[PDB]
Amino acid sequence: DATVYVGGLDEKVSEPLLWELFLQAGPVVNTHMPKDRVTGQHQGYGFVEFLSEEDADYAIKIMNMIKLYGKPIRVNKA
Amino acid sequence: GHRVIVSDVQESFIWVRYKRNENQLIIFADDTYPRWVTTASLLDYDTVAGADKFGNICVVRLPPNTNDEVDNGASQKAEVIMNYHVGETVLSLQKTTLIPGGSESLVYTTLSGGIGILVPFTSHEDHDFFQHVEMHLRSEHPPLCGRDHLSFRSYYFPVKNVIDGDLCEQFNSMEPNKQKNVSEELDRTPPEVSKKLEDIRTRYAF
Amino acid sequence: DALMDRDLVHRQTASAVVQHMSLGVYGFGCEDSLNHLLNYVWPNVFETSPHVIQAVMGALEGLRVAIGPCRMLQYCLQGLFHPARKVRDVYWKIYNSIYIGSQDALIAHYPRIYNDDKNTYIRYELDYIL
Amino acid sequence: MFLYNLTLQRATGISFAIHGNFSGTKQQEIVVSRGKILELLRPDPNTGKVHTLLTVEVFGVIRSLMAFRLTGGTKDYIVVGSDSGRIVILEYQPSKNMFEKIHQETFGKSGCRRIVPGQFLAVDPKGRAVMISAIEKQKLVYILNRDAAARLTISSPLEAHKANTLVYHVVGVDVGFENPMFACLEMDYEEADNDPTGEAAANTQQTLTFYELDLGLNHVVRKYSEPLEEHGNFLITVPGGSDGPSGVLICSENYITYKNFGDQPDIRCPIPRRRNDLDDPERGMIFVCSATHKTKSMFFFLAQTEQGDIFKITLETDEDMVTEIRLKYFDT
Amino acid sequence: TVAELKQLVARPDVVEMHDVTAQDPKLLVHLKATRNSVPVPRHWCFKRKYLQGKRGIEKPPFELPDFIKRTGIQEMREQKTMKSKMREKVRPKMGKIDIDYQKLHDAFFKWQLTIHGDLYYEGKEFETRKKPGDLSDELRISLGMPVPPPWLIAMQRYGPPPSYPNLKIPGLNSPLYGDVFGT
Amino acid sequence: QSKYIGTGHADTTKWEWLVNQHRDSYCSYMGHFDLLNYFAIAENESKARVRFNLMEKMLQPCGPPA
Amino acid sequence: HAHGMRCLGIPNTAHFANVTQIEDAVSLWAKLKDTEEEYEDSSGNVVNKKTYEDLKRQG
Amino acid sequence: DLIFCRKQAGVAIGRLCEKCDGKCVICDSYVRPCTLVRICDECNYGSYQGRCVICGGPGVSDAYYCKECTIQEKDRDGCPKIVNLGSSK
RNA sequence: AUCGCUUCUCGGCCGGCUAAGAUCAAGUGUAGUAUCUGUUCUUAUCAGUUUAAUAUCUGAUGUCCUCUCGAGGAC
Ligand SMILES: [Zn+2]
Ligand SMILES: [Zn+2]
Ligand SMILES: [Zn+2]
């Protein structure tokens, strides 16, 4: 479970408000939030690696309460 | 009547409030320096005065933001607002008003047999003036042994916010050319200067 | 901003600034901010570049006189006995610089060190109470 | 916040006292040293009421204090042993009612140190050379000669340096118009540091050494050494040449010993005890200080115990050879 | 033994990996825990020579103290052909800044960090001083809550986080003002 | 530095460092009239006997080395 | 690692962030882990709070 | 190759030539001349009378210490007459 | 309506001629540091030096016998 997939975001969000955002729950050890080079903008889906698995299963339970730019945030195991 | 001030023999002051219902002893603050403490005194609720076995006088004030109810080796501390070396060990500290109709002041004896006082400034004018006094006096009238004044009062801890009166009073003993020329560097007159130092003594003490 | 290092010359020159400032302001009661700056000064202690190490030396000497030895020594304690050779070389160099001057005023600030079998490491004179 | 400091009552504690003629008068002005304070008193031949002519604060820790005189001179200066690295020679101008700084010399660092001089202070009876010393490793000498105008000029320093050597006390020695001598109590701890057993803690006697200044060779060489039987705290000048023998008295635990060179053998006497004493027998005795009474007729000494017992110390001499010593109970 | 050596100290946590190799651990144990003394910097055992330019390339060049900003010098300082430069010598114009000596006798008087318990090390900037219970402004704006952050409503149901066990967040076991809703 | 007593180095032992600070403390005691007087007050002796016991403790303190 | 510690009964904190073997941290955790209410006979100055409350229920 | 002699400081006044004239010896600076230089006649003698403390020319003035070296008390060490690590002449 | 061609319209990517006109700026040395580039260790094990620990450096490849590195026997 150490990693999660996160959908439905707005590009003003970046890797930092994800950092800050999910460490509110529990620390994101490895952050991945693609920067698209071609048009220089984000599609808004994320992958998160944690310290171990327990962090991330609690993360499955609590985790999908985040709302990025008035809008819904997908978090599921991976 | 509210809090309690612990004085360590080594690590100095420990602020301790007694919670009445839980009956617990609560250390919410401590000193930033080790100091060998003879005795303590309260200038006010938020300040503490203390003397060193080595004959130093420190004053440490709480920050106004202190947390009154709580639960390296500490959490929050108190800045040290004054350090002055008397050169003579002080066994008691008492705040009082020496003379009737006088201004409230601080009192320290010493082990040498001397009795002296610390006094607050009510104005920045006398402040800066006495500052220039100390300044031009030092180099223009060095201490007798050749030892420097500043270091001697900064001896264990660097001086913070203290003007030495016993140096300022030596204005009397200097030669008239010293007295005058310095007064010119001060842009005053020997009577002006002299009486103006008589001011603090008179008003506060004998 | 400068002492936080873009490139060594920043740390060096800025450190020299801390030095001359530190001699200049002495005795006037500004020590606090000089302590804050001493924080950022402190990591630069380690390097082999002659100009930056001698610079840092001058720096910590001026900071010695301005701040007073007590705070210095409180940064220099743990480094004395640390296992590594490097750290001991340096912190002992510093501690010597602090030691030669103001050796008279250091007395109060040596902490309490417990006594072992063959030796009594507690100085009991300071614990005589009237 | 800011605090202005005032003294009100100046300290009455007197650490040192030196008696000399500072006005060029037949009267004797008494320069005493309060803790941080230099002080000058005038007792009165008739009524004895002690007049305070001057009180001055030096803003520095006084360490030792001695008065001296140029040879056959009219007047007396002051030597201030201080906590700074500077010896200063002072003169009290009778008119101006205050001291002047006659000489300022810088021999080393600041504050009470282990190796930095100013601690112990001695001077020659003829006032030729003053010797200053620390507790350890550094013993310096300044030579004094009046100028062409007979005003005092100080020479360049010298060095007695002896490694790892503790100095209990230093006392001027009397040799009339000679190469000056100095009595330095010493001890070596280098035996004690290298002896893991702890034997050198015991079985190590403090070495009495006489240094000889030499004007012509203009250096200070170690000359005389004897091991002291038991540890004495301080020494006493014995005026030599014309008046009396030239030697030194040594105040030691439960003893006093005149111990001198030439062929002069040591003379020991026990420190007398009072009949039926209530103190712990395990508590011994030494002498605190001594004030020599020197007269054109005779001379003697004054000693005191912990208990306050002042004795008059006398010398029984055959020509320049002292055969024995006589101590009579004086007062308390 | 590094094991039993940890029983002799009030704060044995101070003992570390290489600490057991010390020439005198039986002391250093007692020093390193001294009351107000500060730890040794950590950049050694890292072979990187104390810095790299990774995080240092995203920093601003500099920003002035507000006391110097209100003055107005910032706009005065801001380009020139070579012959205009030799004209600037032949022509020359005076008084481009034209500062107000009243203002620069004012600001630094009329108008005009860290404590001892801190020391800087290589990579540390923001983090320690975004934590469970502490967030930035804007992300509050995206969240859009007027002055708990609402998923600490679900930190009620599902339980305190495994990742930060020591946690307290307002209103639950932590009995809150401004931004910071948990400590 | 070497000829300046009290100089430390990387190989400095505990025992030597603490006996140093001891001896320096004792020179301070000999130095300051007051603190000395404090000692005389507390444990009852003469100023003299105090300084004498100290001068005895100069070489020893902590006792034998290791 | 913290699961082994905490489920082992050794709480997870820095204190233990050194030693590996299961045994030693058990004694370390053992290393990790009284008032006087004055009875009326003047002998209860040794008597505990709860004990004197029990003698309140008895009295 | 070039280092202090550090013999005991005497009463002899320091002497600097044209070149070195303004320099405070140790800090290498021209700022705030305050106190005065002292070196031993062992370092200053004879052909060294009124000699430069540095280059070996005739002294036209006297060196003054800065205030910087004053507070750090360096002026109290051994005589700061530089000796080349050959002889002094 | 679709395919192809064409016309128009719109949107998105989206410095003259002459002899070429003529002419053309570099201090040194003593110490010292930094930053670029290129190239080298899959070595196995043990012993010693060494290191905070590594690293590094330094030495050899179970023993005996028989036969032609291999085989057998005794440990
Ligand atoms: Zn010399
Ligand atoms: Zn020159
Ligand atoms: Zn200088």
Short mmCIF file of C-alpha atoms and ligand atoms in Angstrom, two decimals, chain H residues 5-8 39-44 79 81 83, ligand 1:
data_model
loop_
_atom_site.label_atom_id
_atom_site.label_comp_id
_atom_site.label_asym_id
_atom_site.label_seq_id
_atom_site.Cartn_x
_atom_site.Cartn_y
_atom_site.Cartn_z
CA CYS H 5 60.89 36.30 17.17
CA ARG H 6 58.65 36.53 20.25
CA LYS H 7 61.37 37.42 22.72
CA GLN H 8 60.19 39.13 25.89
CA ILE H 39 60.17 45.14 21.34
CA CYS H 40 63.25 43.88 23.13
CA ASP H 41 66.65 45.42 22.51
CA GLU H 42 67.64 41.86 21.63
CA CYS H 43 65.52 42.42 18.55
CA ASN H 44 66.30 46.16 18.38
CA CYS H 79 58.11 41.19 20.78
CA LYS H 81 59.70 42.06 15.37
CA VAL H 83 62.62 37.53 11.95
ZN ZN J 1 63.75 39.36 20.57
#
